[PDB]
Structure 1
Amino acid sequence: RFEVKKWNAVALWAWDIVVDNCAICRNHIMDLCIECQANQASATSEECTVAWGVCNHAFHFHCISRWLKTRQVCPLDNREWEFQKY
């Protein structure tokens, strides 16, 4: 019997962003968010607005709201997050 404990693991993080893709959903910005992907029948597919910051980054409104609920920093660039468009 060989149980395993204390896995010291090393990984390389790299910037992987797709054009016109939500950085939290990892799907298209124009589609519904991963929170609105569930219960799609009840969702009206209108509340998922594409929010843009002063850094010209596109996110889903639900994703960026849940992000700002804990971290006030944009994920793609480590900057304080604003809103400019709807």
Structure 2
Amino acid sequence: KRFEVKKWNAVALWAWDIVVDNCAICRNHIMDLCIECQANQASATSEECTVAWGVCNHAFHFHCISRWLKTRQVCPLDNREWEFQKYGH
């Protein structure tokens, strides 16, 4: 009359995190691909540009910020210094 715990599994996956605003490097919605990339979805680079977040607690399209890092490495949404900390599509 026993049925007891030894090696179960199951799976619970993640709380939350959507970015609501626009990537100030090109001024389009942060969750979509960046303007240069969405407009050229057939190009080798295009689908790569989803959300990348900085220590600034602000986020951008991954190619726009990687391109913008040729300029002074600050987030154009609050001007704090950039360093990658989270990612999302």
Question: Structures share a fold, TM > 0.5?
Answer: yes
Bigger drift between 75-84 and 18-27 goes to: 18-27
Q: Where do 5+ consecutive residues of structure 1 fail to align?
A: none
- Write out the 4+ residue segments of structure 1 that deviate beyond 3 Å after TM superposition: 1-19, 42-46
Q: Is the 8 A contact 1:29 1:50 kept in 2?
A: yes
Aligned to 1:40: 41
TM-superposed deviation, 1:81:
0.9
Query: Aligned partners of 1:71 and 1:2: how far apart in 2?
Result: 62
Query: Aligned partners of 2:83 and 2:71: how far apart in 1?
Result: 15
Deviations 1:19-57 (A, max 9, x none): 432222322112111120232234686412211111210
Structure 1 residues 36 and 5, CA gap change in structure 2 (3 angstroms) = farther
Q: Where do 5+ consecutive residues of structure 2 fail to align?
A: none
RMSD: 13.7
Query: Aligned partners of 1:4 and 1:25: how far apart in 2?
Result: 54
TM-superposed deviation, 1:78:
2.2
- Give the TM-score taking structure 2 as reference length: 0.62
Query: Aligned partners of 1:62 and 1:29: how far apart in 2?
Result: 12
Structure 1 residues 74 and 24, CA gap change in structure 2 (3 angstroms) = same
Q: Is the 8 A contact 2:41 2:47 kept in 1?
A: no
Query: Aligned partners of 1:37 and 1:7: how far apart in 2?
Result: 44
Structure number with bigger Rg: 2
TM-superposed deviation, 1:79:
1.9
Aligned length: 86
Q: Is the 8 A contact 2:22 2:29 kept in 1?
A: yes
Bigger drift between 51-60 and 10-19 goes to: 10-19
